[PDB]
Nucleic acid binder design. Structure first.
Ligand SMILES: [Zn+2]
Length: 254
DNA sequence: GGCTTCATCCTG
DNA sequence: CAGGAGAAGCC
């Protein structure tokens, strides 16, 4: 679950409980139990995302921070229901008709307003690819900036200090769209390629966010090793890059 | 900045 | 059951 999936999840959390008084609040972690009585009768005002960090803002200026890493998942249920699962329940936010449940996540903390800028992840993350105010022109400037122009794309496109919300499938899909492998730096691209990359860094995550739940998003190379590339027909390969799986086409990525 | 450790779930 | 599937820890 990368930035598009976490924003889709947050949209669902809002549809379920934004604005509604909380009738029960439960946390598994001992250090969070103190907030349960404090939040009953308060409500979620908005569910903000910054990449894969999810920020559940409450009406008393507290914010729950949660990050699913590789395994956390939210579920929306009718109040009082809890489908059998063997996942460990970590958070429950309950209203009169809907409840939201966070399973399995281990990075969960309660933030004061000041911490929204000083928390170690929140302080480090870059601009979010799903932020509609972020433009291809600003992304181009960021690629060519002294800070990032000498960074290899293999790790750059996983680094949330560069652009928040990119993960491994988006890395693989964006590099294939622009015909590049991971072993390039922005300083070495021509202007056409830099512009293509800046656009793809925003447009592919936005297209996944808009249509993966639903022209619709599809993987061109992720998990398609052994299949022919739909652009050039070469057989897609699986290898490792940056200590993560990597999918690419040897016929049209260079 | 790139490699190894944490963390939970699911597979082969 | 050991190893695969996002970032926080050690230089
Ligand atoms: Zn190809």
């Amino acid at each position: 679950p990368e930035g598009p999936e976490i924003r889709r999840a947050a949209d669902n959390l809002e549809a379920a409980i934004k604005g509604k008084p909380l009738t029960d609040v439960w946390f598994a972690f001992p250090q969070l139990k103190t907030y349960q009585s404090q939040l009953i009768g308060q409500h979620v005002t908005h569910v903000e995302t910054r990449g894969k960090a999810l920020l559940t803002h409450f009406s008393n200026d507290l914010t729950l921070y949660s990050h699913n890493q590789l395994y956390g998942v939210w579920r929306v249920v009718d109040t009082g229901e809890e489908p059998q699962t063997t996942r460990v329940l970590r958070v429950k936010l309950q209203t009169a008709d809907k409840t939201i449940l966070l399973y399995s996540a281990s990075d969960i903390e309660m933030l004061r307003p000041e911490q929204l800028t000083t928390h170690p992840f929140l302080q480090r993350v870059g601009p979010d690819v799903l932020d509609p105010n972020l433009t291809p022109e600003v992304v181009k400037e960021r690629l060519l900036s002294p800070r990032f122009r000498n960074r290899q794309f293999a790790g750059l496109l996983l680094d949330q200090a560069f652009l928040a919300g990119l993960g491994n499938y988006l890395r693989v899909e964006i590099l294939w769209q622009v015909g590049l492998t991971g072993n390039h730096k922005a300083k070495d691209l021509n202007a056409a390629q830099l512009d293509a990359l800046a656009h793809a860094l925003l447009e592919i995550p936005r297209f996944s966010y808009a249509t993966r739940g639903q022209a619709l998003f599809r993987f061109k190379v992720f998990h398609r090793d052994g299949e022919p590339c739909e652009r050039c027909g070469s057989i897609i390969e699986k290898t490792t890059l940056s200590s993560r799986p990597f999918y690419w086409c040897p016929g049209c990525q260079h």
